[PDB]
Amino acid sequence: TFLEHMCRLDIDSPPITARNTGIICTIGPASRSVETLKEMIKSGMNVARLNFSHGTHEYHAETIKNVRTATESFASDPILYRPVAVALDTKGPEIRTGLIKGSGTAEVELKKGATLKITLDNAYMEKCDENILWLDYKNICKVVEVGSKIYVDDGLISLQVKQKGADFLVTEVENGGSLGSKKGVNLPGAAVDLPAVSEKDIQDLKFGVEQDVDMVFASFIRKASDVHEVRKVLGEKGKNIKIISKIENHEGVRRFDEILEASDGIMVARGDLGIEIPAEKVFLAQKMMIGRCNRAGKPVICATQMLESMIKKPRPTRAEGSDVANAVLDGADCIMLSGETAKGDYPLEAVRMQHLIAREAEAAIYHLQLFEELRRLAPITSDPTEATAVGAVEASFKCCSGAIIVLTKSGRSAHQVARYRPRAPIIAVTRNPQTARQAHLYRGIFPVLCKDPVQEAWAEDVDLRVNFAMNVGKARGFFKKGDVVIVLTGWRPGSGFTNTMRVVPVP
């Protein structure tokens, strides 16, 4: 009984299992130094997120350089080295207002009920007033109708369409407040037809490919074709880069299935969604998307103001503490920190609290129960790897194994085991550096980069990689000698196929 499960939760019983959820940290002026980055990695950071909404390429190249400098600082000890991925989060397509009467700093607020006209006439670009407002979205009138709502400046200001002019709109200020220059606009429920990527996104994406980033968090994704566009721009040289689509508006939620199908992962951007749809429905959207991603076996990331308050506070608010725990309880693969680590004054404490909350939340989940539903909703397959994966997870529960060791080149086999959410951690051993880093996208996977040189005979090379995982598992305290672990590898060498599962006692 679930209710009976809740009743049995105990705060006095320390979490036993390791923290399965990945932690993604936005890097900025307050966590940019190799020094701080080293600590953040020790504190649990698995992915470094660079927010391209701001900063120059040279600025970001140096951030990435420092991240790799700090990461390789631990390579002298292969057994403890933790791969650290680099994520590029695009500024993305957006609608900005013009400049209010000359200068930008100048603000012209207006009272509710008042009238306000939205003009596409470029003549009013740098001359916006409490009576006339210029926007850079040229199809604004075609995707909106009389009665539509329009938010200005991150939803701070609200408006409602009364009459649809030709190249303009007349609206009543439902809300109010200080209106500034070049502010972001949102069209709740409207099918915005802006290109999938902006011209700035294009160059940033190209930069990402040359910087060899592991994933891209693509903004404002609202249809499959938007994902394809992002994919096309990354091109042949960026084909292995994971594309995580950020669901930020109503159309994105409505066409979520086709978007998920086309993506490698998903990110619930509660911040923008909170503007785009009724704030009271965001928790529903988040839970729906996490659930579908878990069902599909694709990574899902939760972020957008998790532990915000921790900018100048030692500990998080109660709402934030609850939010991170429930996100992981919902089934999120990774939790992301923004601002709290990019700016703030407590970047380290923020990462540590994130880690603590996650492991507590994970200890409070009924793993066997979560797995039964996954296998239940999962269909009959003819793919031997899928069958091997489910059998390994089951065998793992039966002997309460210290881990499921998975040898993988591309990471696929490890991902297949991860979708079934075993309780035991998944130690994915690979010689591919990129696979090691990208693995953090999947909950429960603990990637380890095997340094040792390949062995002539495939059989010996397999034992070498398996024993490496064994030492890692021992070192990290996942298990010890005498315990039992599950191992997934292949039957023969040059044929490729993870269809072999072995139950082996730890040396």
Add this chain to the structure above:
Amino acid sequence: TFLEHMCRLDIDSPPITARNTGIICTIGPASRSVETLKEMIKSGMNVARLNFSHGTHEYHAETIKNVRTATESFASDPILYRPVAVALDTKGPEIRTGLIKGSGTAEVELKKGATLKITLDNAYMEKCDENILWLDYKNICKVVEVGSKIYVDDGLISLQVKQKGADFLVTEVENGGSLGSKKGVNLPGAAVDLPAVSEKDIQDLKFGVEQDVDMVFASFIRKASDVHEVRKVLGEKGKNIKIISKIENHEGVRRFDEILEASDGIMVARGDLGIEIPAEKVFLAQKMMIGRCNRAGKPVICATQMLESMIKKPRPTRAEGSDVANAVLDGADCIMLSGETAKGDYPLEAVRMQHLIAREAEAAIYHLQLFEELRRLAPITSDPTEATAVGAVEASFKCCSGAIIVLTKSGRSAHQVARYRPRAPIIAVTRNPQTARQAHLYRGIFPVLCKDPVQEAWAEDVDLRVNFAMNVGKARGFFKKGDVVIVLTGWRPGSGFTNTMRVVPVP
């Protein structure tokens, strides 16, 4: 399947059922006027909470007066009138520091690692320094041990016990920051032996009895005897006043069962708990207590910074939106707003968002599933009312009734039906004004105060009260003519017993 349930959640499908969770609003200078109170009642406020940590009796008497003035403003229409309860939240027992070197405003912050001594020698009362700190808890040394942790000023500052002097303690400043005068102290994990109520609490409680308040939110409850003390002080004249115990520390959580047994309800004070125990474990404590209260059939309240941000913002943060939704999804009977309605600048919007989030969260709960566990965990009874209650809930699901109408004097019968969490709303018809107000403590109960005069014959009086509920249900849109509703009353008059259930079509 739960995962399958998550996958099916839809933000485009409006919530059908009414908002079952009660809304409690802290009243202060920003929501104290009869004018604003009238609006707050229309916006969903079921309970008015007065925070006695501040304000004079005369100040509170006027607040209560205005609340009743606004509430009775709607009595001209019995069909729509909504009872509104008054809750008294005690300042409670606490540990305060002395005055730092003379004046209070004077602050003397200290760096981490630095040494700090805690003295009970009253000679240092108004002379606290970064080297000496006076506290008013005289048994401080007896309930603490070397290694213990001590928080100062709402946990902003941290310390750790090194050596236990006689009437003092030497500690290292684990944290740091500006230290002020007369600040609240917390002893995480320590069995504080302060009296159940302070001398200020005593007079406030007495005041509550003379003001005829409906419930008391008793602070710092950590054992059954503390509840009894509160009960003793309210005395004979305050015997019908509901005592809701606020769990605010580790001992409170450890002895939760005996506290729940002795209380009428429970309040999870996440704010104080966040200080008293590891912040990462608060979500666990909240979920455990809500679950046990649901199992016991006793009211459970969640509060302590729900929609805080809404002090000068139109909409809540994403973490807060998630927090309120998950609290109701956890099974909380009421959600409380503090600051957001007491101070803030958007008291009305805050109440409305609270209501919106709650009904969305309720529409997203599998009612039949929630009920099956309750009846399952519920034991075999010999009490006819309990059996009548379960049968009414079941019959309610079978015909998808528009409501379960319960005639009750003390409210008990309505509470018994509420514990089984039917989907249909419970219309509790009573002639007892206090019962009507106190009913809001229980999720799903919609109290209606019957004005009509008692009828000579009990049979006619029953039909009169049942028909009143029918008109209320129609008026509020719970159901309409031709629908079916469940009615719970008694077999005979002067014998008292709600053991009769009828399934009746709506007139």
Add this chain to the structure above:
Amino acid sequence: TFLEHMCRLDIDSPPITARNTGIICTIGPASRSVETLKEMIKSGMNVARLNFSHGTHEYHAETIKNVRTATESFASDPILYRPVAVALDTKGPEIRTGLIKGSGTAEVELKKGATLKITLDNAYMEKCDENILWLDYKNICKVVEVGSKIYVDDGLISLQVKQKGADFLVTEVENGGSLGSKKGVNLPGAAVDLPAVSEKDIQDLKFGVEQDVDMVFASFIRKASDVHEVRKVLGEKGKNIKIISKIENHEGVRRFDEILEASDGIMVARGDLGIEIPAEKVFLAQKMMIGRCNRAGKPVICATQMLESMIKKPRPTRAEGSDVANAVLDGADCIMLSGETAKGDYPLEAVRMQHLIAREAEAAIYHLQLFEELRRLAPITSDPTEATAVGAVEASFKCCSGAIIVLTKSGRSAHQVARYRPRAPIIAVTRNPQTARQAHLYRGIFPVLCKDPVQEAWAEDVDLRVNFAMNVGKARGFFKKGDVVIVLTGWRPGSGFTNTMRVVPVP
């Protein structure tokens, strides 16, 4: 866990609940005397079955007379009197062979592989040989095809269609054995188009109406229209007579749903079905039909050689003991004894063993579990009686009531409660003698015929009938003073509606 349930079964723990399954006994020369009938009633017989395949009307009228003489022998004590129904089981439509070479006693067996022709030429009526066989089914050739199978003499002999002549058929004797005169023929899988009733059935049915029988077990039912025909023949004066359709062949099973819809009940005739379809599939057909009848809430009867062996043996075989127990475990409403009570030498022991097996089997069923599925498969209703019925059953489980007392005129309300299979017995109090007798068709219903005179005021008459049930429940040991019982009656008198449930302690 079901497997865990099996593991916990204990033969050393006496059955607590009463025997819910009805017992139907075929009456014949060995159980026809008022003397033996009195004992059989004391031993558990609820229904007396007269097999009209044999015997004259005068012979049956006397049997019925004796049954009523024995039944009324117990009317001097209303509290213990047990209604006893009379069932008329029709000979039904059938295909008979002619007379083999002159006389009937003459048998002409044939060896397998041998050739045999089936002729419709009446010229061979009384001249059947191992080479020519006459049958009275004139459409035999139209409903059969080359390759079809034909059984002769209760399936003892088998044949297979080779060539379809004009008014005859040539077939190979797949089996073999002694062939007699005027033997019953079966056409497995063939859509036999014989009239729904034979001319003998017609007169027998008419006789049943004038004898005021309670139910009719209609033979060879294979389509809805067959049921209607039976209904039409019983006419206006036999409209209250329950029609139980006997599923005896493949078409009957294929069109079971439409037959169930049209019938009042169902009887699985394993004997004939064993011939009509592959013997190895009969257990499947029985379980399917019992399940669908339980789902539909319609009576289902299992018979056809239950405790056969008990013709000259003190105790039943092991296969028979298993068969009766599993039939009740499957959900059968009644179990029928044929031959064992009609002929045999141990009619009394047979009835007693039947009763013993049934109560043991019932004690071994998880009642709450059986009920949950019923309510689950049961749809949302708008019928108040259905809702009242489910709520009464639920309340019954909650207080582990000694019984659910149902006041009913037609018996409908009692039937509605019976479909939900409560653990507590259902005491159906009625003043209608026929309702009392027919109630035995439903498992769990204990009918009691109230003798007392109707009371002027409806309220007093209700209490009179409820108290009668109370005394009956006490007398029969279902419960005692201080226990709790569920009572189902109506709100008002001349309006008719069992929508009122009360939980009352036993006086």
Add this chain to the structure above:
Amino acid sequence: TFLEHMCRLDIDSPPITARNTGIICTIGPASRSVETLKEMIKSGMNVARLNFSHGTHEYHAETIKNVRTATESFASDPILYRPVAVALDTKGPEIRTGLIKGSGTAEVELKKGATLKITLDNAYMEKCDENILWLDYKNICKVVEVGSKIYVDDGLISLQVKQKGADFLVTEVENGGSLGSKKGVNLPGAAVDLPAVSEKDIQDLKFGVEQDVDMVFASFIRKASDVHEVRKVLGEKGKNIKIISKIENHEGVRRFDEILEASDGIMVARGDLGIEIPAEKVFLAQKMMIGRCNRAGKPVICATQMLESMIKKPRPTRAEGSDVANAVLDGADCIMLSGETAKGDYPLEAVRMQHLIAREAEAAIYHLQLFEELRRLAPITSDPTEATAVGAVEASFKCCSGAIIVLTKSGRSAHQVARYRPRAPIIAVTRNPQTARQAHLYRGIFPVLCKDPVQEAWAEDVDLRVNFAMNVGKARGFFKKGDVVIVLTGWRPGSGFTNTMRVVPVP
């Protein structure tokens, strides 16, 4: 839903899976010829049971010789050859009466209520009368008490203890009937202390060892020590012989757990149990023991008059058809035929019907559901083989494999997979002839004896045995090329350990 499962059963949909339940046939004068034995093997017989209650050693040696002659008749085709086991069923310990007045044929029946004395005085051995009855159980008086019941001649006659003399007993004939000479006696509920084996059993068991039988069905087992005794007698040379304990009386059921623990398997002897305990409780005992055996993973056999009627009838009764189906539905590993194949006139038809009923019953079982309970009740293990076994079963369901191929020497690994009841058949490949034969005791195991010569390299020998199973699976129609199968073998050669599972497509 189970009820919903019953409703969906269809007699028109042919069973897809193969017949998993083993068939055991008693061999006698009517199935003793190599000719008939060849047919019986083709018809499904997996085990030949010799009933040692009758016949000489020379007689049985010839039966066994003929069984092996018929079995080896199919060895010319390794792909289709079916191992056939030989079972020795002991006469067992029993209580016999003396000779009635001189000769044995002489019978002296007595009427009920009459008095009858039981004497241990050997002087009355060959002089038994309706007044005096001699029994060979010398401790009869010590294990019985006043009021005890005593059955004579297979329960045909009943008696009840009135006064306990010194070396005799006085009893009233509760029943009645013809009393013969040297008849079997039963003491229901009495703790009979006869030795575990009789002197005849001892020699028969010795004979079994020299005849190299595969299993022994030990009679009258009622305590663990009885099993040990049987084990001791079989000695070192008979240590691999499987001991199946026959539960035949109340003490046997009461001490079932310790008996199961000590045994290799269990046989529910409904015939004797029907005498020893109330006939109405036998179905309960059978279901309990089958359930516990399934939980323990030990073979359970059901027999004692399954298809008895088929002595001179083409098809079985309806009660018998139901009995065999329900026994398999209960979870029995094997069903046994006695008399129907030993004597009868339709030994072949009996075996075929047995096979048909079993596969129909198996097609009607929810395999996945049956497996979930087994794994649920199954505890956490540290044994890699157990974990490998569960993972193989799970992987089997995931890809709906055509079979689980298990390489085994002793058969243990195959047994471990069998306890989890996969839907796919288990092809146990072994080079040990005895293992192949004994495997039939476990439901779902299809043993195949690999003839091919061992290969130098273990890796090649494994592929050779796996490919043999593949050809067998294809030949028998379990699966075909392109399908997927699960394979269980070991990691390395001379280390022994079935901890390796592979999912492989069929060649």
